[PDB]
Design a protein around this ligand. Structure first.
Ligand SMILES: *C(=O)CCCCCCCCCCCCC
Ligand SMILES: *C(=O)CCCCCCCCCCCCC
Lengths: 72, 745, 41, 41
């Protein structure tokens, strides 16, 4: 799960990169602006640290990032 | 200029195709918004408003029209920054790739023959006819035969070569004197087997083949002679003798086939005039027939040579008998064992090589190793900085066929404009692609620039011309370095002067950690490869500086070492004199350097390499490039003085042509006659393989002369070892102290 | 400083630019982004 | 390492486990949780 604040970071990190947009095109590197909404998803279920406690966090259409994504 | 219905329709078609209606300039009913920052200058009245979109992507300038490419133009691949993830860069390809792609084969071999004489009566050593290298098991098999046959047809068309080949040799056994004539002028000749009459017949009567005199008369035979009686060499013949009784009949399921041959030779070695020359052709020289032959006709003739003219991959060898005199003594010698052994040693090489090729008339799948895989896009919008499919498929494709060709075409259909982008996916790409951790992008500018229609794609496993003698040699090391680097304990390896674009990444197990280096910048986005496994260092190794902080247990200076001595304008011996010690310090256990020294002979090639003797230097293509060389002996001792404990050894393109899965494996034609050139070009530039990890040899003669007993000493602590010295890719001396089988003497 | 034109919304040598620090807005980007284990999650 | 069975979804001596560090995932729980006055509220 990608709790509210943890999106602040990855957004604040990507925000500081998007800033350099004019230099990415100029030098043909990069690959377009990096939206954090490209690494996440909209699954829904119970989200906790263990079956026991995850049972008390029914989240619907929350925004989670899969492992292989947490990689990119 | 003059739109034609076909064309208008191809535009009205492109317009209908689902797309994105341009949105920069909104539509009005009484005004055309024109970009202020645009060439167009508004007329006057109230019809043109100077509206400026928030971000128009177009800049100005024009384009000079270029004529339609007459043939599919290949496109070198230069990479971009962003890289697609293997997963995404896969389906992207699999969403627009031409999978079951039908492809033509063409012809992989077009050259002459690679003939190889062998004197059996020559060798003075007796070799038990019972223990020769008997026909290899696999030989007769659905899988092996299938290939032996496939290779056969992959040869652009054969007796004209073979037959002539045997006569090129037979011309050397001709004795003109009266004392004991052999093929003396006007000698009668018998010939069996014809399709009209053999094309060689015209030549023998023409005296065309230099060295061989014009025979009086030629009497044809065989199963379809069409000019002589039809005889069956198995049984008896009702004809008279001949000076030369050239027999070329086929034997073809092995024992009766041996009987067939043993019988045929028996009557062919019968039709020859006393003191003549019978030239039978065995199909399967089995150590089963080699006992029957050396037993029945152990007397019949005086000399005997095997003349295997390798036109295609087959084991049929030619045997010629000296003087058809009753009291001869044709004993099986060690020559035979070697000759026979070299033959097979090559069919394993030629077969293993051909495995990489698909069977004719089979739709291209992903299975075939040499399969040609493409990607046809329709009006593809290759865009920089965007992972749009059209530009996403371009990635995979080039990644799936890097060391290859990559040819892009654009045929204009009266509908859209398709643009296939094939390439010969070989095993040299599978090795490279595997090492890739990600699939990098390609600067689509070059593709976006084209805008001209080329010819339709072809999809052909092989190109049309035989590769340059130089490549036959290069692809002779890409197989050698491949087999050396395949060794486990090798660990971390570096390449002093890899190409601008690491060409060694294909010749290394996807797990070994290598670090290619070159003065020029690397052509492939070094980022796509896992840093831990692949490293890249810029700048030359010729300069002392470069060697700070670069430690690899093994270095390989192939294709560079020669250019560095020339570039640094220094002496070849003196150059490696400073490089070898650096590799020692760099922490190197092994070394491989494509040094160019005349170890076999100081003789040169007319067009490939000139050996200027006033100044130790070469001239690859006389001028194209000049690089200094060393001598076998001086350079040998100079390196032995550098690394005293290290064991040296010269590996060179071996006549077995086992390297073949690198020429026929990548899809390139060749000349079976050039193999000889390259095995002679490889001798001009061996690969001095050093190994500090073991004790070096000790040869008592030093400049060892042929036919002199020499003392060699391998210092191995354990007596329980098996000595097996092999020369030419064929073992010649093998056996624990007690017993040692030697075919080299 | 050669004129560009669209690559970026501003020309450098463009008309009426103006270097002028203000004690009010200390220039910035984002360096102290928190990523430590407990704080990133 | 004696077999347990259900207490926890994994046996230690269980079939095909595998110790294998990857420079990619530096093992870490949550130590730097922020609690200082201003930052906790
Ligand atoms: C044209 O390039 C002439 C040089 C003028 C600007 C070059 C760089 C120096 C000024 C920097 C402007 C951007 C932020 C410092
Ligand atoms: C049975 O308990 C035999 C001992 C095997 C594991 C004991 C503890 C050592 C290994 C630790 C595993 C859990 C994290 C270290």
């Amino acid at each position: 799960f990608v709790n509210e604040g943890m999106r602040e970071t990855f957004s604040k990190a990507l925000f500081d990169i998007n800033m350099w947009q004019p230099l990415f095109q100029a030098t043909k590197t990069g690959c377009g602006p990096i939206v954090l909404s490209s690494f996440t998803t909209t699954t829904s279920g119970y989200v906790g640290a263990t079956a026991g406690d995850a049972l008390d966090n029914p989240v619907t259409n929350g925004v989670f990032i899969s492992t292989v994504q947490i990689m990119n | 200029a003059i739109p034609t219905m076909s064309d208008v329709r191809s535009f009205v078609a492109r317009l209908m195709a689902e797309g994105d209606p341009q949105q920069w300039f909104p539509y009005r009913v009484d005004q055309i918004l024109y970009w202020p920052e645009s060439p167009f200058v508004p007329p006057i009245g109230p019809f043109y408003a100077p509206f400026r979109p928030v971000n128009f992507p177009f800049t100005t300038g024009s384009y000079t029209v270029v004529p339609d490419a007459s043939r599919p133009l290949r496109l070198l691949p230069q990479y971009r920054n962003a890289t697609i993830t293997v997963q995404q860069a896969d389906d992207a390809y699999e969403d627009t790739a031409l999978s079951p792609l039908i492809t033509t084969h063409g012809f992989c071999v077009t050259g002459g023959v690679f003939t190889s004489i062998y004197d059996i009566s020559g060798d003075p050593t007796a070799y038990p006819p019972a223990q020769l290298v008997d026909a290899p098991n696999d030989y007769f098999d659905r899988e092996r035969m299938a290939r032996r046959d496939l290779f056969r047809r992959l040869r652009a068309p054969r007796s004209a070569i073979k037959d002539r080949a045997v006569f090129d040799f037979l011309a050397s056994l001709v004795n003109p004197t009266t004392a004991n004539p052999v093929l003396d002028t006007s000698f009668s000749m018998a010939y069996l087997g014809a399709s009209d009459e053999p094309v060689i017949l015209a030549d023998i009567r023409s005296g065309s083949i230099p060295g061989l005199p014009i025979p009086r008369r030629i009497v044809q035979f065989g199963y379809d002679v069409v000019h002589g009686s039809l005889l069956d060499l198995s049984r008896a013949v009702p004809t008279g003798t001949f000076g030369l009784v050239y027999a070329d009949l086929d034997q073809v399921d092995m024992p009766a086939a041996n009987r067939a041959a043993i019988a045929m030779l028996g009557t062919a070695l019968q039709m020859t005039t006393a003191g003549g020359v019978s030239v039978l052709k065995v199909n399967f020289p089995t150590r089963a027939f080699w006992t029957q032959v050396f037993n029945l006709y152990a007397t019949h003739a005086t000399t005997l040579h095997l003349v295997k003219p390798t036109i295609v991959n087959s084991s049929e060898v030619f045997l010629v008998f000296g003087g058809r005199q009753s009291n001869g003594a044709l004993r099986s010698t060690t020559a035979l064992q070697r000759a026979l052994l070299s033959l097979y040693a090559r069919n394993a090489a030629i077969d293993r090589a051909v495995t990489h090729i698909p069977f004719f008339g089979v739709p291209d799948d992903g299975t075939s190793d040499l399969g040609i895989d493409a990607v046809r896009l329709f009006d593809p919008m290759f865009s920089d900085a965007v992972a749009n499919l059209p530009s996403n498929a371009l990635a995979s494709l080039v990644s799936r066929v890097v060391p290859s060709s990559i040819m892009f075409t654009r045929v204009p259909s009266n509908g859209p404009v398709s643009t296939t982008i094939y390439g010969k996916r070989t095993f040299l790409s599978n090795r490279r692609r595997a090492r890739l951790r990600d699939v990098p992008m390609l600067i689509t500018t070059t593709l976006v620039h084209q805008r001209r229609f080329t010819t339709p794609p072809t999809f052909t496993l092989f190109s049309s011309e035989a590769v340059p003698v130089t490549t036959l040699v290069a692809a002779g090391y890409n197989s050698f370095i491949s087999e050396q680097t395949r060794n486990p304990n090798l660990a971390h390896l570096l390449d002093l002067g890899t190409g601008p674009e690491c060409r060694i990444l294909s010749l290394i197990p996807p797990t070994l950690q290598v670090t290619m280096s070159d003065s020029r910048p690397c052509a492939e986005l070094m980022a796509s490869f896992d840093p831990a496994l692949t490293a890249y260092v810029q700048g030359d190794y010729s300069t002392a500086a470069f060697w700070n902080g670069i430690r690899c247990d093994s270095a390989t200076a192939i294709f560079t070492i020669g250019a560095a001595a020339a570039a640094a304008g220094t002496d070849l011996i003196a150059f490696v004199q400073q490089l070898i010690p650096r590799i020692v310090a760099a922490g190197g256990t092994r070394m491989w350097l494509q040094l160019n020294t005349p170890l076999y002979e100081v003789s040169s090639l007319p067009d490939l390499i000139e050996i200027d003797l006033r100044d130790h230097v070469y001239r690859f293509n006389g001028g194209e490039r000049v690089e200094p060389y060393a001598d076998p002996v001086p350079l040998q001792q100079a390196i032995a003085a550098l690394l005293p404990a290290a064991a040296l050894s010269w590996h060179t393109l071996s006549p077995t042509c086992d390297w073949l899965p690198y020429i026929i494996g990548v899809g390139s034609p060749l000349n079976l006659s050039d193999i000889n050139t390259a095995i002679s070009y490889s001798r001009l530039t061996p690969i001095l393989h050093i190994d500090t990890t073991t004790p070096p040899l000790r040869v008592n003669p030093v400049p060892t002369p042929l036919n002199q007993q020499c003392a060699i000493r391998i210092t191995s602590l354990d007596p329980a070892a098996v000595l097996s010295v092999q020369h030419n890719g064929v073992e010649v001396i093998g056996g624990t102290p007690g017993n040692v089988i030697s075919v080299a003497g | 400083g050669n004129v560009q034109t669209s690559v970026n919304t501003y020309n450098i040598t463009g008309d009426g630019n103006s270097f002028t620090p203000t004690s009010d807005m200390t220039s910035t980007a984002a360096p102290a982004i928190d990523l430590k284990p407990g704080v990133l999650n």
